[model samples]
Target: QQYECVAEIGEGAYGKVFKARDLKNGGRFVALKRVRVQEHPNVVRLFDVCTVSRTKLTLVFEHVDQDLTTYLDKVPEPGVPTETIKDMMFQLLRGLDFLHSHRVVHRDLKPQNILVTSSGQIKLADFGLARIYSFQMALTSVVVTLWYRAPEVLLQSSYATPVDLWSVGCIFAEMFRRKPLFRGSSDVDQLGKILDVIGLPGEEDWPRDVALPRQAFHSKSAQPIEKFVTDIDELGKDLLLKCLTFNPAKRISAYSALSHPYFQ
Candidate 1:
């Protein structure tokens, strides 16, 4: 099978994404991710692969209408239906569960990385910053967008799959509020924003046998989730709190987060 380039849609960390036509399949439209990475259902499907050059590898993916960022923009009035939010959360968690279970950590999950089909299916995309978790070595804390980055990552602490869930928590909150939960201008500013809502974690909150990462510290009262997302129900707020917990050890796992009452 061959693809005739249609138009450039966007770009990933490694390559550009394009909307293309499958010449062998009735000119079917598909989003060619043009990455060097899958077959998971909740992930964008790879229709085919092509080597454009000796070093350039292209991956063809199923086309989607827009990303979560654009979809939220088009949502009418207050927000999308609760069920739609539930579906988005469910699909996203399921996809993350699959990846995490397989030892892959999508360190850069964000609204722009989440693709939405017209039918409402959510597909996790952009794995350029992803890495397989290895107990022998500590992963970098410099990954993830500032808005969705976890507190530990901001502090330059060693991180793992839980870091991805922190991004999920931020995305989850954005899904409800139609904007980023913590929009910080810099790494320090991002920590301040997170502390404004999540508050300062003490020895009890983030009990560490060893010393935590050294950084500028602050003492701020935590704001209730309801204070930020006024319309979120109790179950939703509770789940969000779990994901945004200051302690990475206490953060909910993707496998466990799938069973959160917010999804039920």
Candidate 2:
């Protein structure tokens, strides 16, 4: 046995991913997951893969101890520097833009899945592998995080790459607020939460094929995002609303978002 499991780092439908050490070799660190590696500086680099058994497999990634969530929590009082935030957002958008350019959508884009190296580099993980061997196959209380999920996905309507951008917007806001924008109990509740802040979508905006109707919820006017993200500047506020636009077709792309003046 060359590698031995050390501590659990990521837990999916089950205890799926963890940190492992090379036992008899260089003793280097690796994050072991069950998937493939689409290599990029911002995307987690796949070092190697091991066939644990005839029916078992492991994907080894360069070890990254701290993640974006931990990094945000560690940010000192007042707030993270605008320059630092700008840099992080640039890397994040750059990574997403790369993935998008290749027609890859990071179905999962939470802060927990965003790995941050000691050198302060942002590396995205847990992408396409989710649907293949995920708990979604079981489809119980074990559903993915409702918070990062977009309106179309929650409404049980068709969705595409914009769904991933929705998650990015949530993380974008969280970077400043240091808390999730919408902490919902269930799907409808989550929509209600989102609607409360972003303003409820009008009848014309509602999807005809969906089960839930706009008439089902109370009417709420659009609230300025600055109230929630008190520290964000004008340009930052501008970018966030575009990312969070209720209509998927109208949502900002990673390419366009990267070009936003907030980064300039």
Candidate 3:
């Protein structure tokens, strides 16, 4: 614990993230994350792990200058440069690839969870909400967040890597738009907002619609994707469609998403 705290920069459910400087490393900057893990387990880039007691844990993470959410808010109206967006997207895909490879689904993928440095390096955080999926399932519903949940997860279907990609799609659109692409209060409202903008699910496209345990309560039925994000980047549109597909089986995984035209 030689790294002295320079300032209390951030905090979360587990503990505070302090701006720390390594005393032994000639004042090198670092992040001090005090948590309650057994041994820190080197989940990501935890450089230091010191246990206060058998049940208490304090971790040290590399300092990230800022988080994407705060950075976006402080930026201009039109938003950061296109190059920065591309870099952010690339980092997202890269980190997601690593997560999926390790059977980890960052169930809560959003701007708020992504951290960035002054030099533009990106790091995804907050694994407490993550769902460690060793394998995929069917006909299951796991609600990560109303804004980022995929159509399959929303329709009470079991999910896997595809669910994460759907959130990526949401994030991609969010970077270019004023507000989150979609926001809903309840299941019905969520699905309604989604279908109203992204269109309704059909039997041929979604045969298990009637089979899903929690169907949305809407007087109307399916719609199309042209309503909300029609003016978005073309590559972004294609990738979003791939991610938001009703069939979880057909949706692209994080590995394949990197090769999509959006990255080009």
Which candidate should be chosen as best, given lDDT against the real structure? 2
167-241 per-residue lDDT for model 2 (tens digits):
888888988888778776578888898999998877777788788888888888888888997788899888888
In Å, residue 113's CA in model 3 sits off its true spot by 0.6
For residues 1-264, could you state the per-residue lDDT of candidate 1 as single tens digits?
477887877555666668778776676787666644326878977777778666556877776668898999889987978888878988999999998977888888878789888888899887343322222235433424568778777766747789999999898888888977887656777878888888887756543433343234567688788777657778888888989998898889999999988876
Highest-scoring model, TM-score = 2
Question: For each candidate, what is the lDDT?
Answer: 0.78, 0.80, 0.68
- The per-residue C-alpha lDDT of model 3 at residue 87 equals 71
Which residue pairs does candidate 2 place in steric collision?
none
Candidate 3 least-lDDT 10 residues: 127-136
- Model 1: which ten-residue window has the lowest total lDDT? 127-136
Model 1 bad stretches (over 4 Å): 33-39, 53-56, 127-145, 204-215
Ten consecutive residues with minimal summed lDDT in candidate 2? 127-136
Over the stretch 62-113, how does candidate 3's per-residue lDDT look in tens digits?
6565777678777887677766876777778788888888688877776667
Q: How many residue pairs clash in all the candidates, one count each? A: 0, 0, 6
Which of 2 and 3 is the better model by TM-score? 2
Runs with alpha carbons beyond 4 Å of true place in candidate 3: 5-20, 24-44, 127-145, 204-227
